[PDB]
Design a binder for these strands. Sequence first.
RNA 1: GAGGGGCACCACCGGCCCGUCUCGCCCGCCGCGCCGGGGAGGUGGAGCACGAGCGCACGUGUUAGGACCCGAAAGAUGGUGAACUAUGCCUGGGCAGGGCGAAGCCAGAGGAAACUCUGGUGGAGGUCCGUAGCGGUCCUGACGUGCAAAUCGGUCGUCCGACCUGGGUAUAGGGGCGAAAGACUAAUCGAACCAUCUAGUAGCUGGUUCCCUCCGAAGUUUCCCUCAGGAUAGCUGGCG
RNA 2: UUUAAAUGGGUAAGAAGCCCGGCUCGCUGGCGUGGAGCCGGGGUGGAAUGCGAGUGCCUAGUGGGCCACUUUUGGUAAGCAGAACUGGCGCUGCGGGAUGAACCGAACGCCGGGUUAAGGCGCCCGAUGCCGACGCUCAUCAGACCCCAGAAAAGGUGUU
RNA 3: GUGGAGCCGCCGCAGGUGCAGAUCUUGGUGGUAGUAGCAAAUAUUCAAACGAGAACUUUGAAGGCCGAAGUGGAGAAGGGUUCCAUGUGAACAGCAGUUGAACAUGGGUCAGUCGGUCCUGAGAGAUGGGCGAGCGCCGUUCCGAAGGGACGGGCGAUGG
RNA 4: GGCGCCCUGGAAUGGGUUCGCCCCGAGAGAGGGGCCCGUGCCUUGGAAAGCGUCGCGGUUCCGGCGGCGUCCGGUGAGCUCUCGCUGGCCCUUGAAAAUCCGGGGGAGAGGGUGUAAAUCUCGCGCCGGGCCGUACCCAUAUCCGCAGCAGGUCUCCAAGGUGAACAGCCUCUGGCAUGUUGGAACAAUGUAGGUAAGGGAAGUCGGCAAGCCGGAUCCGUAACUUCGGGAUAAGGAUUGGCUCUAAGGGCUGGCAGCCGACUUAGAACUGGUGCGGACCAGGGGAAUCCGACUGUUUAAUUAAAACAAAGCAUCGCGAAGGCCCGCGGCGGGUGUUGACGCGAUGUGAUUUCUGCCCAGUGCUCUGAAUGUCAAAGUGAAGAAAUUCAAUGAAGCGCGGGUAAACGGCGGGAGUAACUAUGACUCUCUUAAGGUAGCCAAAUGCCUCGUCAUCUAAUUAGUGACGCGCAUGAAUGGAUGAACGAGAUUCCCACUGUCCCUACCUACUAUCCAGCGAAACCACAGCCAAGGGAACGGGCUUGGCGGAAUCAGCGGGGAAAGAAGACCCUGUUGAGCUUGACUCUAGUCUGGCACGGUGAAGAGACGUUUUUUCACUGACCCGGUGAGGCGGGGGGGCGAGCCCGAGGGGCUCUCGCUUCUGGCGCCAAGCGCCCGCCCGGCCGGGCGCGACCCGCUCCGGGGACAGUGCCAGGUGGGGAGUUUGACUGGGGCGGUACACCUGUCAAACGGUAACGCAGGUGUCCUAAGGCGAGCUCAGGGAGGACAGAAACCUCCCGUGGAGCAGAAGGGCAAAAGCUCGCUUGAUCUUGAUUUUCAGUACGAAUACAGACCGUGAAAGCGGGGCCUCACGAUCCUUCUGACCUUUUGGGUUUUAAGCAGGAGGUGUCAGAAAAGUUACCACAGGGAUAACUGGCUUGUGGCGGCCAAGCGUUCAUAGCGACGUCGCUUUUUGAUCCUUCGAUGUCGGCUCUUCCUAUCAUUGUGAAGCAGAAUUCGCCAAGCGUUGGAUUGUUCACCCACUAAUAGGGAACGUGAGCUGGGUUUAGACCGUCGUGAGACAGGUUAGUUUUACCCUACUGAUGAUGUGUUGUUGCCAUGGUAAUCCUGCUCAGUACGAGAGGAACCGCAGGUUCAGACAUUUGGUGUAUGUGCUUGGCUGAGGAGCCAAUGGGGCGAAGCUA
Length: 252
Amino acid sequence: GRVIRGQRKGAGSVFRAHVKHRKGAARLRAVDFAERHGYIKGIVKDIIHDPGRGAPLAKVVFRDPYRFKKRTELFIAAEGIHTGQFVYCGKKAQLNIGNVLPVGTMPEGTIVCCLEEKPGDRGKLARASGNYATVISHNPETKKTRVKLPSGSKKVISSANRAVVGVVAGGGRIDKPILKAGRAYHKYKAKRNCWPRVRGVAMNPVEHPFGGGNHQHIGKPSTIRRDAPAGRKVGLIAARRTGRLRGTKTVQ
RNA sequence: GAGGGGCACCACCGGCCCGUCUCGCCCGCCGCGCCGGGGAGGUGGAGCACGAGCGCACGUGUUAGGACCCGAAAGAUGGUGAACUAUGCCUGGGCAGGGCGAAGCCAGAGGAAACUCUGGUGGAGGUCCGUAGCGGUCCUGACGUGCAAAUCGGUCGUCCGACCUGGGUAUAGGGGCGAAAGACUAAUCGAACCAUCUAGUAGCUGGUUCCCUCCGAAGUUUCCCUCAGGAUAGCUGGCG
RNA sequence: UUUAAAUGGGUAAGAAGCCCGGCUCGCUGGCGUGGAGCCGGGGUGGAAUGCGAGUGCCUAGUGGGCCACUUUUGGUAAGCAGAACUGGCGCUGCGGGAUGAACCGAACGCCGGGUUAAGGCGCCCGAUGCCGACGCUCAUCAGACCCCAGAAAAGGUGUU
RNA sequence: GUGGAGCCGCCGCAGGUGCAGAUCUUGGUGGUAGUAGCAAAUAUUCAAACGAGAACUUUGAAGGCCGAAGUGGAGAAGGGUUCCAUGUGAACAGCAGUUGAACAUGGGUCAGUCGGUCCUGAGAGAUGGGCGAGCGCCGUUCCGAAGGGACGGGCGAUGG
RNA sequence: GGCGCCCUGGAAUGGGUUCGCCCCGAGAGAGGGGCCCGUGCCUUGGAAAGCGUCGCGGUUCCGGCGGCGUCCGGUGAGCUCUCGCUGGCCCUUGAAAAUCCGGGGGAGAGGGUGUAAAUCUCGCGCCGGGCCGUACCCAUAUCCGCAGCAGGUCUCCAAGGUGAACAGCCUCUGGCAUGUUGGAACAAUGUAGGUAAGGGAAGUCGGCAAGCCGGAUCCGUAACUUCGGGAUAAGGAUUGGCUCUAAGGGCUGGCAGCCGACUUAGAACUGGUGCGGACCAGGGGAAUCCGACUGUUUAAUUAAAACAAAGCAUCGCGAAGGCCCGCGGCGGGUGUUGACGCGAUGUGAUUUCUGCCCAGUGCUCUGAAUGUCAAAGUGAAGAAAUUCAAUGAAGCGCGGGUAAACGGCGGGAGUAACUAUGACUCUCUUAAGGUAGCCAAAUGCCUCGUCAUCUAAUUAGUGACGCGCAUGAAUGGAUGAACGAGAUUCCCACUGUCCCUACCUACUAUCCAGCGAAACCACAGCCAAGGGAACGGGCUUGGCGGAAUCAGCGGGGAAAGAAGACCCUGUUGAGCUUGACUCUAGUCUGGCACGGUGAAGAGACGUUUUUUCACUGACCCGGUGAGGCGGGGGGGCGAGCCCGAGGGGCUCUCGCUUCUGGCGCCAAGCGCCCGCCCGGCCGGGCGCGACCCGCUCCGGGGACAGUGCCAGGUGGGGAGUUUGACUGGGGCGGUACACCUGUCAAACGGUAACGCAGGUGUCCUAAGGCGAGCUCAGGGAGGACAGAAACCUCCCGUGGAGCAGAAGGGCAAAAGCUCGCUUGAUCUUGAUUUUCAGUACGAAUACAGACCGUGAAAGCGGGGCCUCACGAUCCUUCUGACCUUUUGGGUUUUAAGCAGGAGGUGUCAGAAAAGUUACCACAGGGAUAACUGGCUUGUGGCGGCCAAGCGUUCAUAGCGACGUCGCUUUUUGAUCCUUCGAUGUCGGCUCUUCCUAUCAUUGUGAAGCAGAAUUCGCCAAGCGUUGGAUUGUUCACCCACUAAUAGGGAACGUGAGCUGGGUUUAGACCGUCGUGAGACAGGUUAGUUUUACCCUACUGAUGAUGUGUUGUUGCCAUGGUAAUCCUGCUCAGUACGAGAGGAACCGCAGGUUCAGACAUUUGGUGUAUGUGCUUGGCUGAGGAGCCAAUGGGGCGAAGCUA
Ligand SMILES: [Mg+2]
Ligand SMILES: [Mg+2]
């Protein structure tokens, strides 16, 4: 009769994110006349750190084309960049590390981070620490290019989508063990109120579909349908298969 | 002695009206018909057979209403609470002394070399002993109409850490929050508290207030989701 | 089960009966047959005992019962479970059974005299304080009054 | 006998119509009973003074405790006059009280520079807009003609 | 003090440096500067004030008057605070704004000169600064807890000694009156603190509780190991006081001379072997089970093995997405996000492994493969309502995948040269048959398994074994260091836990002065038996019965607390669960709308359907301060291109920013035009620089998504409700729940029980109807095969056969067999019977009016030879009349009626219905279980009577079959009387009494009694009937001692006497069971045990009545009563006896248990606080003392005491 734990994460009372000491959205600068037709020069000032993100950031000062003003962007730091480096951003930008330029002009098989899934959306895909995407298959008629996401799933996107050349810094992070319960606590204190996950088998029949019984057992099959209602989707939600995995994934 | 007329009422026979049923023939014409009416028998009706009702008052019985009085566990509607406590977040404050001695470093010694050994230095750790703090194992100690609607005395757990804590702030009742004990949410929690619906319902417990006179029971029948209850016949009293 | 009680159950013991003559009928049919109904007429003393009866309306409470002879079912048995007939208790005091729900007598307005019932009469405690009758019995565990509240098989050259 | 201003009989009428009980309701009073009790944190003593009156007030003297993570010195929240003086001893302080945070009368809190005031934090909340039968809610940059100001530069009027 | 500041100059034989590091050709060292903090000192303030001290005036303001002083040094791992310098740790990076300031730019502005402007963050001077808070407490008395409440409640400041220390103990500054009272006494019982001879767990469920060990220095340390640990392992040695010695630093001079720190080591002397002297402070070892650890957890009964955790897996998702919120919006959260991410689960570090199953239940994927399946739409028939038909969404069904999804892992056959088992082979159920491992496990019923080992003795522990009721692999299996306020077993050490208690101390209790309640209370308060609601205080019969009281005490008041939490009932609830009943949010699909423009393709019959592409304008999503969009031309250094002459433009290109941590705006210039200069000077204006036109701001989707509405899926996520009755309590079982036969049943009828013996929910077109002819079961005697049984014949044959089935009744030219016809098993109205209320249904009887059958006819027949074989209202369906009504009147369809058949209610006079609760709640019930008590005694026990036997012989010394009669209430039942507004439920411990059915002790009788020893009876309950191991045990079983180790009762004596082990709440684990919540006298673990001050009883203490008062000395009525058992020597190795063996009485020495006392002796105790020893502190030191809640410790009188 009582609501379950994942149902209470949608109201967002204590399950809202911890966003105070974060710096801002890490977004490419918006497209205008300079990047549709040419390039523009910017210099990165400092490599900073977000709490709760695994990647670092790069704050880059550009020269405003229309007002006399220097205005600061925040980029996802591509790996290998340093402070006091010139960063070039445009259609006619030259393909180096850290330069951001449209995916339709760059060749096939170049490694891409922080790319747009619809044009002008200022960077959505392939942004976690150490991740990247690969471009193949330019279709210069009905201009669409297909990329390869970090999940191995390919996606045909628009050609004028914009993207910084390189891989996201801070990679190899998940190779280290958390190694004790204390350093997992500090990990999620930067992120959310989510960390000590009680098993639903351990709680009571008000609190979960799996709890109860004189023995800790699930009882009911732990693969459930996708059109199950809220408060019943717990466990392996619309699982195509179970058991320890064989092969690679063998389902497109 | 006998005879006669017989009230009311009771029993019986006969008749009458309405519905139906069988059997049968006749009659009438604001128009001759897939019309109207009648007969003789048997049956169904809360009927007729020279009317008794109405209004008013009182008494008894039963029913619907708070319904002889008091009593739930509930359900619903609309509100008030995070001054305790649960968890986030904001901004502050707090934690003696010792023990072990990681990485780094320095010298010396062995050795043909590869390298090894030794002594320092160094001070790491959800590291150990252990104050303040935070807890609350054992005595199954004291207290148990207590100092106290949970306290005390030893003893004990942990004290750089998932640490302890103040004020600010957020989340609210089939909701919240929960390192999960159905824990905690103002001494209230396997669904809070306030007011209303509400005098909710009870075949179930308790109670039910003056005197004398007369009569005086039953615990059995049949039916019931009936078995601690009713209805029905018996038993009773009252009126005639 | 041939036979077959006791106890028991129905019915009859009159005028609403008995008899005679006549009329109706569409029933019955050799028949003025049969049977029903109907009218008129003739004569009342028809077992014992006891009692005044008939009928209608309204109607409360009750719908857990229990007990004892007798007869019975289940049970080793039960102050057990379940029936039959009658009485009682519940609703009921009183005399007695010391005691008591139900045993035995007897049912009850308020009192005086008398007499009894069941039970009794050494003393509690009313009444044997009779010159009561005949026998039986000795217990180092005597006996002592329906229900009823304690005993059996077996044995004694104990006594009759 | 107390009491000090109303009351009753009869014939009809009408009821919030008579108590011993409901772990009844409210109020009062017992017995228990001058009883249980006034036992956590080492401790009091002598003299004096004022007074009707002193184990407890004050003052001196001795002896002790706390022992600087204090029984010491100041604050925050909270309280609200509890602070201070004099008077009082009815009640209250669970013995007493000549004492008090009690009662009675009268005093006391002074700021440019101590804080509030100001700023924003998590967050809270209008307007535009949206939703909604509606009280209203969502929402905080989102679907908004969201600047009322100006170093300036010039015209036009207008004034010392 | 700091500097990641400068200049000179260049370093290697590398140097400078720190406690550590670190720094250097990107400039070290060295030399000379610069800057920042200066909270320190000097000075102004400022000595005039402050304080200390010595005076002197002033009665009263006096912030009186005056003298002198307020001075030199040292030191430090010191404490506290501040400033700084450098490191480390982070999958953790540790706030915003208000304000304030520097810098860059240079639009402007300024006096224009032999004088002063604009300006000034410089030095002084003037004016103003409103509003509100401001006392005090801040806590064992100002706050919260009902209060002056051992509780709670945020901070800062903090001295001397001892010492590692903000420890403990002692003192100074500053506080206080011992915590809401004083006095006297020093009994019990308590609470808190000690101590104890000898023994050392013998106590106990358990070593619970207490005690040991404890600091530091010097040695010395194992198994095991994840190599880090363990580890303060373990095990030793030492420690004082006093003298000394040796070592450990600073600064001044040209290697020496003057001052400072408390450490370390070594030796001597010394004391009654005493030294961490108080204080502070690790008991250790060997093992097993569980959890890796640290963490966390039910505030107020559980701290754990639970939860969490790192690690390991699996799952969903590329944003119009996934998972959630929301009454609502394209509203919110994850998301200031983007697969190294978010969301959803499970297992639980490491190491080592992860077996076999896709049948089931889920989950998931697919081909115009196909079964089923809604609205809308399509077609047909009809006058229409309406009806039918075909087509076919998702889902289901079918097929595939998936077990680190829920989960499951059994049998049965054959098979090896003793037997056994089965490597092997073959199959069933149901897909597979439990692999590696592991085990009587926290998982094994039987079971206290068997076997080793530990003990004198072990239901314990450990190690094995393993067809294992019911082990098993992320339900995770097995190991394994470290760590557990976890569970358990042993060993050492230690001890009053125990033998077995004793004594001392504080605080009480006790008495007094003051002050003073509450629970509770029908009336009350001495018993034995009887009866009684079966356990009286009162009642009956007995015993008996003096005031008034005090300190105790726990037998009784079935003592108080509470309308039993168990159990049952209720047509009372609630929490959860699901393959319950009924729905619901949500979501997946189809339709119609919003919803437009075009093209192409396809399926079926111009008609209809469907698909894919293109468009954009609705609609939607991004982005932006809606900042350059689309077409068109300006420019060749680029193409000079189809050809080629000076060039032409089928086809064309874009542009001006890319070695570097710099700057970039507010227009230059050119052309025109005005007022201003007489063909020249000021101040303004416009354009080109900066192309033109145009209808979305730019991109991305787009007639889809989305939304409104309806139809169908799915939907315990959520809501509502339900969960039969009877019942020797309930459940399970059964159906005695509707019905029929025989009996019970007691000779009319009626009659109960979960009484007995059975039966029914059908069967039958003949097994209904009628007529005719016939005789059955069985037997005898004959007949080819032919027999017990074949068919044929004759005789006998009263029902011994048959009649559909259960019984009972009935029946012979029959009610049975065979045959011939038939449909009366049809239509219709009443009455009667049965059950019964004298209602209904069902069944039946007698008719009547029809139409029929059969028979020659009489007749018989409206179901079955009779007794059973079945079913309301409402609804539905069919039939019946040339019927009645269909609402203003007609016609027609339909609908409603009337009449009677059917489609059901078996809980059968008829609801529509799954669990669980140990998290539980209410109303009740002793109408009703679990406990005692009561009736009963089957059963358990203990006895007799008879005598076939046994006993060499010999029934009865001792036994005794086949029987048979009893007792007892210590067994277990049976029953259900008392108790449900409560009688506290096992065992042990402690303690008193009682019984006898006698184990021992006294006196005896009988043996198959030689003696010794046994055995069986008698009077007899006087007196005894132990110490232990395992176990919660009662019970058991074993070791040992003994005269003997007999059995019982007292509300299964005894919880205001205890304990809490067991059982029996709530947490948790395992096994089996269930889909699940949950269940299991199956196992394991952790789990609040309240009150006497009342009345009596008992125990002690005053006293009361009576004697005139009072005293001394006495008597005894009555009541209590207490002693017991063994051993040794003697008798004696004698009697007796073949021997072996082997008595007793008298006497004598002790002892055991028990009872009464006592302190000479010896132990304990000890606060004579007696005496000296001693640690830290304190009084200036000595001397003498004091404090440390009794500072410790050695001896100790008296007194108590074994
Ligand atoms: Mg978890
Ligand atoms: Mg009689």
